[PDB]
Write an enzyme that holds these catalytic residues in place. Structure first.
Site, PDB file in Angstrom:
ATOM      1  N   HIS A   1       0.845  -1.236   0.120  1.00  0.00           N
ATOM      2  CA  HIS A   1      -0.048  -0.022  -0.032  1.00  0.00           C
ATOM      3  C   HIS A   1       0.876   1.344   0.086  1.00  0.00           C
ATOM      4  O   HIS A   1       1.929   1.160   0.189  1.00  0.00           O
ATOM      5  CB  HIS A   1      -1.178   0.105   1.103  1.00  0.00           C
ATOM      6  CG  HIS A   1      -0.386  -0.069   2.539  1.00  0.00           C
ATOM      7  ND1 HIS A   1      -0.249  -1.015   3.442  1.00  0.00           N
ATOM      8  CD2 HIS A   1       0.280   1.149   3.272  1.00  0.00           C
ATOM      9  CE1 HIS A   1       0.314  -0.716   4.490  1.00  0.00           C
ATOM     10  NE2 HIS A   1       0.725   0.212   4.340  1.00  0.00           N
TER      11      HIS A   1
ATOM     12  N   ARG B   1      -1.776  10.754   4.506  1.00  0.00           N
ATOM     13  CA  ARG B   1      -2.604  11.556   5.756  1.00  0.00           C
ATOM     14  C   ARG B   1      -3.632  12.878   5.233  1.00  0.00           C
ATOM     15  O   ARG B   1      -3.342  13.425   4.416  1.00  0.00           O
ATOM     16  CB  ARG B   1      -1.460  12.482   6.642  1.00  0.00           C
ATOM     17  CG  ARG B   1      -0.453  11.594   7.279  1.00  0.00           C
ATOM     18  CD  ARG B   1       0.511  12.391   8.219  1.00  0.00           C
ATOM     19  NE  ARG B   1       1.503  11.540   8.562  1.00  0.00           N
ATOM     20  CZ  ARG B   1       2.813  11.319   8.134  1.00  0.00           C
ATOM     21  NH1 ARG B   1       2.770  11.767   6.619  1.00  0.00           N
ATOM     22  NH2 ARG B   1       3.652  10.422   8.601  1.00  0.00           N
TER      23      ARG B   1
ATOM     24  N   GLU C   1      -3.928   3.597   2.003  1.00  0.00           N
ATOM     25  CA  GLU C   1      -4.276   3.641   3.302  1.00  0.00           C
ATOM     26  C   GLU C   1      -4.250   5.445   3.683  1.00  0.00           C
ATOM     27  O   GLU C   1      -3.343   5.919   3.337  1.00  0.00           O
ATOM     28  CB  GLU C   1      -2.832   3.332   4.163  1.00  0.00           C
ATOM     29  CG  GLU C   1      -2.905   3.432   5.654  1.00  0.00           C
ATOM     30  CD  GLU C   1      -1.697   2.996   6.458  1.00  0.00           C
ATOM     31  OE1 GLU C   1      -0.639   2.749   5.671  1.00  0.00           O
ATOM     32  OE2 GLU C   1      -1.754   3.134   7.786  1.00  0.00           O
TER      33      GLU C   1
ATOM     34  N   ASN D   1      -5.175  12.079  11.706  1.00  0.00           N
ATOM     35  CA  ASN D   1      -4.697  12.600  13.282  1.00  0.00           C
ATOM     36  C   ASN D   1      -5.798  13.377  13.868  1.00  0.00           C
ATOM     37  O   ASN D   1      -5.991  14.361  13.190  1.00  0.00           O
ATOM     38  CB  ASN D   1      -3.376  13.128  13.134  1.00  0.00           C
ATOM     39  CG  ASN D   1      -2.294  12.244  12.786  1.00  0.00           C
ATOM     40  OD1 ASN D   1      -1.993  11.319  13.817  1.00  0.00           O
ATOM     41  ND2 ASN D   1      -1.635  12.362  11.533  1.00  0.00           N
TER      42      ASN D   1
ATOM     43  N   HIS E   1       2.247  11.385  -6.889  1.00  0.00           N
ATOM     44  CA  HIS E   1       0.927  10.905  -7.171  1.00  0.00           C
ATOM     45  C   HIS E   1       0.740   9.281  -7.093  1.00  0.00           C
ATOM     46  O   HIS E   1       1.929   8.724  -6.841  1.00  0.00           O
ATOM     47  CB  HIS E   1       0.379  11.300  -8.455  1.00  0.00           C
ATOM     48  CG  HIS E   1       1.148  10.815  -9.592  1.00  0.00           C
ATOM     49  ND1 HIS E   1       2.005  11.400 -10.275  1.00  0.00           N
ATOM     50  CD2 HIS E   1       1.297   9.536 -10.107  1.00  0.00           C
ATOM     51  CE1 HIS E   1       2.634  10.727 -11.237  1.00  0.00           C
ATOM     52  NE2 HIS E   1       2.215   9.504 -11.259  1.00  0.00           N
TER      53      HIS E   1
ATOM     54  N   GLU F   1      -3.309  10.394 -10.983  1.00  0.00           N
ATOM     55  CA  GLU F   1      -3.268  10.376 -12.221  1.00  0.00           C
ATOM     56  C   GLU F   1      -4.295   9.396 -12.827  1.00  0.00           C
ATOM     57  O   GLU F   1      -4.108   8.139 -12.268  1.00  0.00           O
ATOM     58  CB  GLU F   1      -1.810   9.884 -12.640  1.00  0.00           C
ATOM     59  CG  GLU F   1      -1.419  10.077 -14.234  1.00  0.00           C
ATOM     60  CD  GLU F   1      -0.029   9.778 -14.484  1.00  0.00           C
ATOM     61  OE1 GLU F   1       0.538   8.731 -13.866  1.00  0.00           O
ATOM     62  OE2 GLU F   1       0.650  10.339 -15.355  1.00  0.00           O
TER      63      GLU F   1
HETATM   64 NI    NI Z   1       1.467   1.442   6.198  1.00  0.00          NI
HETATM   65 NI    NI Z   2       2.570   8.596 -13.005  1.00  0.00          NI
END
Ligand code: NI
Ligand code: NI
Ligand code: NA
Lengths: 139, 139
Positions: free
Chosen positions: B6, B10, B57, B61, B75, B118
């Site tokens: 993954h 944030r 993910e 916070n 990206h 993208e």
């Molecule tokens: Ni992680």
């Molecule tokens: Ni790309």
């Protein structure tokens, strides 16, 4: 039908980055794409080809030697067989180790451009993930 | 054997991010991990389970509602069947469209926190990747 294809990060020294991801993490270079007219080079690396894997895209911008990191982007996580052994090999090669747990579940290391990479024991992570999906009604 | 598991970003507001990645992009919530005492929540989303897919993910916070971005992280790229149709749908729901080519191969859209995504016509992308690999001797 949709699929996660890659994650892109910008790197200051393309060959140094390639060396880290290949020699230290065991990825293979898939292809390169130089665009001199727009002053950048792309390289794709991964554990399989883009056709069947989600991969890593490196972007080198001509003359940009280094990058500053924000508090927004987190990390990429890579599932492996033996976190302890991999971390030991990283230390041997002077890669900064930000975090290493006791049980061999998880570690964080720093790439040559200062990005964080999370290393996870894939078997334990997948067992946990499936279990939590089953507890939460998604599996 | 290793695998990309993954990418973590944030986010300021779980509800709005989840709405975007599910309703606008077609991902599903796979599981959540909430730690009130450490003041954070993780949400894993993707086009398939972590066991067979590379996912996204999100980390929230508690009480942190905005993130400013560096020009280091790039990206994530998502392969789709129809970029133009998607971009239209996005523009209908006030999603910022940073770039959209005439051909339908590529576009860039912005998520609720300012991260770039993208959008790629996956067919065309994979044809190109394959030809590049064969030419470069990596296939
Ligand atoms: Ni992680
Ligand atoms: Ni790309
Ligand atoms: Na640097």
């Amino acid at each position: 039908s949709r699929r996660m294809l890659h994650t892109m990060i910008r790197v200051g020294d393309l060959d140094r980055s390639i060396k880290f991801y290949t020699e230290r993490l065991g990825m293979k270079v898939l292809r390169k794409w130089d665009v001199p007219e727009d002053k950048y080079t792309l390289v794709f690396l991964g554990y399989g080809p883009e056709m069947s894997s989600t991969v890593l895209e490196l972007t080198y911008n001509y003359g940009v030697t280094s990058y500053k990191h924000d508090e927004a982007y987190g990390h990429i996580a890579i599932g492996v067989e033996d976190v302890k052994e991999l971390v030991a090999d990283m230390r041997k090669h002077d890669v900064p180790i930000d975090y290493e747990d006791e049980s061999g579940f998880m570690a964080f290391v720093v790439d040559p451009d200062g990005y964080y990479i999370e290393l996870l024991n894939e078997k334990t992570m997948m067992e946990k993930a499936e279990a939590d999906m089953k507890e939460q009604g998604t599996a």
